[PDB]
């Protein structure tokens, strides 16, 4: 191998600086996409339910 | 194989907390963002709408 | 080959159910992202000229 | 080859209706997507300011 | 190698125009569209409070 332990040594190394699941980081970043922007619409719907 | 049985298993074992038919799951991030954009349209036109 | 005559194949199966040329689908979420950003811009201006 | 010869001929031929330095087109996307989120940011704050 | 070699001097050579640690780019990117909607969030917040 080499190149493998080479790559993964690589990542805890410069990871070391984190706490996180890694699943949480890669959930978190998609989900909470879409998250925001279901949370952009319901807030431009508030501000009108203000106008009216 | 032993590369791919292995790659599909820890799928299905990781995925065993999820209740989707996989298309869902991909048409669904990529069509809401889509749909997000033009919702997020729709919606501050609305407002302008009111100010009027 | 088998293999690329397999992914064709199962391509064309399960996109039975589309009316595009291709080009547009890839294009139109692109494309589209980037637009919706550019449409939000001019929008909210909009909310602003009519608070003056 | 062939297979480059292939490829690199069949991008020139479909973007044969295009003008761009090909940077401009990458770094455009991205480089917008990110100052559409900036700019968003911006106008909501210019609509508060006229709120007050 | 000789590839690799080819790749790496290509970037340095079209990077000479850059002045970032590289992993400031690339966590810039992602986090930046994420805190993005986060901004956007707080913000038709705001606005929503000066309307009531």
Same mark, same amino acid.
């Given at each position: 191998m080499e190149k493998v332990?080479? $790559?993964? @040594? +690589?990542?805890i190394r @410069? !990871? +070391?600086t984190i706490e996180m699941p890694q699943? !949480? @980081?890669q959930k $978190?970043?998609?989900l909470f996409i879409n998250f925001c922007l279901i949370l952009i619409c319901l807030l431009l719907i508030c501000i009108?339910?203000? $106008?009216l």
């Open positions: 332990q080479y $790559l993964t @040594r +690589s990542a @410069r !990871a +070391s699943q !949480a @980081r $978190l970043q998609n009108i339910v203000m $106008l």
